[PDB]
């Protein structure tokens, strides 16, 4: 029956693990990748503080993912009891450039359905971790909460083989982490109320400084940069930002949708959005 | 640990009780009224299908309410086990005309904090029931779900003593249930991006047809009217509307905030909003 919580005593701080701050890791999943799963299992944030939430599309592809995901969860949750995740929720979804717009709008609904259903009165942090992020440091959560920001996006790169240099290498991958520019605002001012700007919209091109390219091999991993747009690859959100209402709009919101409109929404709710240009995590390879 | 739910198999229908559709009744509460509580207990929707959520402000007034509320919950949850509410969550809040704007914006955060924290992967319906609604029919939930609408506002009146006629009587109370008018849109088109229109804004006056006055003593209780703005007095929402993202904006949203901006948000998410002009429920008396 009865559950009592003072939300003002629920903190999100730099020292999340020591303070026993609960985190909810949310992953929309069209394809199950074992390395994503193994990378998750290698996170060293205490398991008793972690809840997991997944949402799969209602398609042949989603159902194959669901099967593999269910099997992986069964193995972990029936191993030693001290190492179980506190809770795991699996949901199936309720629901050019023009293709991208439609796809992003559909994703916005999936993310909301998952977020609303799973966030609770004890959650301090929500980590948005896409199912194709296959490599992070094992201290990902501690590393990111340390910054104590309302919203914090890691920079998403991708490994590949460099044919010229005959050696493994890395390249930028996620261009949804960006700062707004005057050029970006002007172009948006001139647009109709339901026109959406998404990545690859010709005239803005890369005129909104993309975080991916601020990666500095000579810099340090704690570097922070102010952002205006984020993706959902590996993006850490204080629970209070979502509880105040910031969500993933399926409709045009200042000409933005989904994860980018989310950032704009958190700013309207008086939160600041940041990114880590020199803290890289990795999206699955083209060759994988 | 493990919880599985297909959200597409989670229905909100006309025959909610028979279909065992779970409802979450959400009440922000600054003042505990025994008649509100007794009226809630007299609802005859099955208890095993009801979860309750409350959120109180962090003030002397809220803490007095909290004490009385806790006592009332203890009595009900430790009576016969067959009649317990499935779950009860109590939260304390994390956080002219100009006064109304500030008050409504603060309420929007409270409603979101409560909604996000308490809605779950099994919820079919969310009833927003203000803590000063002290009389409804005992079949309130069945009566309202019967309509099978995305959003449905009951018409909120208030009892008083008629001094002239020397007899109990009734008067309209909630003017946040309205239809938009051309005059309303024109006046809003001419306003700055962060100007808010709230009840009592001089120029719109009552030019947005108010549902309160469409009450027809000669009409029938099943009458439906299309709305554009709602309050949170006694307003029933299919869970999918919230899961898709519709929430209570604390920032100006098409010049609307809180419950009115919520309705506008659900419309942007392609939902239709309705009201019951001849289905009256009652806000506590001035004399009470
Ligand atoms: N629930 C759900 N997840 C999806 C869907 N499409 C892609 N995903 C997941 O959403 C995330 C982003 O995937 P996608 O946009 O295809 O890859 P990207 O373009 O390389 O970021 C990954 O976690 C995918 O598994 C969908 O239709 N529904
Ligand atoms: N959590 C919370 N609830 C409030 C606060 N102020 C009022 N309420 C509740 O919000 C609802 C609307 O109350 P109010 O706006 O004062 O009454 P109205 O103007 O007659 O609708 C009722 O359920 C009140 O108990 C607040 O600051 N925080
Ligand atoms: Mn991908
Ligand atoms: Mn009142």
Author numbering:
A (entry chain A), B (entry chain A): 95 to 189, 202 to 394
What does the paper say about this structure?
The ScMnn9 glycosyltransferase is essential for the formation of mannosylated proteins that form mannan in the yeast cell wall. The synthesis of mannoproteins starts by the extension of the α-1,6-linked mannose to form a backbone of at least 10 α-1,6-linked mannose residues. This reaction is carried out by the M-Pol I heterodimeric complex, composed of the mannosyltransferases ScMnn9p and ScVan1p. ScMnn9p and ScVan1p belong to the CAZy glycosyltransferase family GT-62. This family contains metal-dependent, retaining mannosyltransferases that are predicted to possess the GT-A fold and use GDP-Man as their donor substrate.
